[PDB]
Amino acid sequence: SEITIGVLSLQGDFEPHINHFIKLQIPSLNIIQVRNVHDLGLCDGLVIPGGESTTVRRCCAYENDTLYNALVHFIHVLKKPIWGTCAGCILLSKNVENIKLYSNFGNKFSFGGLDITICRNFNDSFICSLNIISDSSAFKKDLTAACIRAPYIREILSDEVKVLATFSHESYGPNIIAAVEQNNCLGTVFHPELLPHTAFQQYFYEKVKNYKYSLE
């Protein structure tokens, strides 16, 4: 079957995320940039990366929020798989704290999808070992994550949110939440493209594959 995963690309610096899925070497997988609603329509799943949530959001605001509204629909009506990483994780979140830049978009800042409170704030680079709460073969023992000015997940707001991975750091403390999953949404605070392994990419691919299978 042909599976297409898109990577939101408007904000730039998206190539390493694309490369990391290509490294999976999975015959059935195509990756595309997503810059507009036509591109989004071709996607079975979408990755939203980025360093800065406000930048990615402004990129979606063009033409009276045309792409923003399509993303909301994609997430919440179509229920297509979405992976928000770093900035994208912020933009899936219910409550966003410490984003400073006042938004021309108000309560239309987030796309929603993860019932969490997240803090941008806003030392601050390290590799952590992950405790991953999963039976997926994507996750071998002792995997790592690169946290660079990572957002902080302060609150889980629904029992529907599954804490997928946590870590301990001799600062921040124990049981820092690194990855969450809720329905069709996956969120990670780290940079999955900046470590050689491809575990989260593989997991998200399988999520998209299972979605496509469910449809039919």
Side-chain angles (χ1 to χ4, degrees), residues 1-120 124-171 173-216:
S1 166
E2 295 270 303
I3 289 296
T4 300
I5 295 174
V7 180
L8 191 75
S9 69
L10 295 167
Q11 69 294 331
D13 288 330
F14 57 84
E15 297 238 304
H17 286 272
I18 292 181
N19 176 74
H20 240 77
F21 277 93
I22 295 307
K23 285 177 77 166
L24 297 169
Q25 299 291 293
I26 297 171
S28 286
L29 180 58
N30 301 316
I31 307 291
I32 68 168
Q33 289 182 39
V34 169
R35 303 156 283 146
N36 58 53
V37 299
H38 184 246
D39 297 328
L40 180 64
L42 300 176
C43 289
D44 293 317
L46 176 71
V47 180
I48 300 191
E52 296 192 5
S53 59
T54 289
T55 302
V56 167
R57 181 58 183 85
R58 179 161 289 147
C59 290
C60 299
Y62 310 135
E63 303 184 44
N64 188 30
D65 262 358
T66 288
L67 187 55
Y68 174 77
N69 292 328
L71 292 168
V72 170
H73 172 262
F74 177 102
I75 296 159
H76 295 291
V77 180
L78 299 185
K79 310 289 192 199
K80 289 199 188 178
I82 191 163
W83 182 12
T85 194
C86 209
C89 192
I90 291 174
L91 291 173
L92 299 178
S93 300
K94 183 172 194 22
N95 300 309
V96 180
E97 298 179 340
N98 198 44
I99 38 162
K100 320 176 93 48
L101 302 173
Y102 277 81
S103 115
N104 35 34
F105 334 100
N107 66 195
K108 289 193 62 201
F109 184 77
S110 184
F111 310 121
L114 296 172
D115 292 335
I116 66 187
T117 299
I118 199 168
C119 308
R120 117 159 160 184
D124 69 346
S125 91
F126 59 89
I127 292 169
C128 64
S129 198
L130 295 177
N131 169 48
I132 303 179
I133 303 92
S134 183
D135 302 316
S136 169
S137 67
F139 302 125
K140 301 166 54 151
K141 65 148 193 131
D142 296 308
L143 289 165
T144 45
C147 286
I148 302 182
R149 89 198 166 164
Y152 177 75
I153 297 172
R154 187 172 72 74
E155 302 179 322
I156 300 306
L157 301 170
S158 169
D159 296 311
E160 288 185 10
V161 170
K162 306 318 165 168
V163 171
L164 178 58
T166 64
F167 65 96
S168 286
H169 187 63
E170 274 155 16
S171 296
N175 309 319
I176 306 185
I177 300 174
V180 289
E181 187 167 17
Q182 185 177 357
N183 304 306
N184 55 305
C185 301
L186 172 66
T188 54
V189 308
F190 51 89
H191 279 267
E193 82 290 6
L194 292 187
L195 298 177
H197 75 255
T198 52
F200 286 84
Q201 289 82 7
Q202 185 181 0
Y203 185 71
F204 185 65
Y205 171 80
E206 286 290 334
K207 191 171 174 75
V208 178
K209 183 202 85 181
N210 289 337
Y211 161 84
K212 210 159 180 52
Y213 282 7
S214 75
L215 271 183
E216 55 208 49

